[PDB]
Design a binder for this molecule. Structure first.
Ligand SMILES: [Zn+2]
Ligand SMILES: [Zn+2]
Length: 224
């Protein structure tokens, strides 16, 4: 019953893996002070020749590599979503903006990005955003604070896939960077996610290996 994952792009700086019929993980790498060399995940949803991207790679160069691949595949890139204000979500937004691809994020991500002098998403939403992807859609939803105050998820119901971003930890992973975190809210937010999407088959964390609903339960337990 498992989908046979397939690598569809690989370079020194970026890997893209198909993880379900319509969803893909993009992986870029961050050499950071306190935690080592860090893989950062985003998601691409592709259907009917159209694509929506969740998170940019941290750097402009890696984001251009991502967009070059989507262009070689002849895809219309409809939107990019920054799932919170940190650079492993939006460091590469100008590559999207240069191509007239609109960027979206939680309303508070816009103000936080501006206050940090980071690339700014163009369009804010307050609650739940629907983004068309071909004949399907992907949904962006705020369930509360956790990894940051503004973090949002992406939900693609056709394949029962959740992009948890940095609010969701890989199975067995540590708590990671808590500098901007609300650890009181975090388990409450994650339980709201589990309760909303009980049928999930695939959960993609912001860092590390993706998996199934286990990741939601693991993350809630880690912060309980
Ligand atoms: Zn973050
Ligand atoms: Zn992160």
């Amino acid at each position: 019953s498992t989908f046979t994952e397939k690598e569809v792009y690989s370079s020194d700086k970026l890997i893209i893996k198909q993880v379900s019929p319509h969803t893909y993980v993009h992986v870029s790498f961050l050499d950071t002070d306190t935690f080592g060399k860090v893989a950062c995940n985003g998601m691409i949803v592709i259907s009917d020749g159209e694509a929506v991207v969740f998170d940019t790679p941290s750097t402009s160069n890696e984001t251009s590599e991502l967009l070059s691949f989507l262009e070689e595949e002849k895809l219309q890139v409809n939107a990019v979503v920054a799932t919170h204000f940190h650079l492993d979500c939006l460091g590469g937004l100008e590559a999207f903006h240069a191509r007239n691809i609109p960027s979206y994020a939680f309303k508070n991500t816009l103000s936080l990005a501006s206050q940090h002098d980071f690339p700014q998403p163009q369009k804010g939403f307050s609650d739940e955003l629907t983004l068309k992807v071909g004949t399907k859609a992907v949904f962006v939803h705020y369930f509360g604070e956790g990894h940051t105050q503004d973090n949002v998820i992406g939900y693609f119901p056709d394949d029962q896939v959740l992009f948890g971003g940095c609010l969701i930890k890989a199975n067995g992973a540590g708590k990671g960077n808590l500098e901007d975190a609300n650890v009181e809210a975090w388990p409450v937010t994650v339980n709201k996610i589990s309760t909303a999407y009980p049928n999930l088959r695939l959960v993609i964390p912001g860092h590390g290996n993706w998996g199934d609903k286990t990741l939601l339960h693991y993350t809630e337990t880690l912060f309980k």
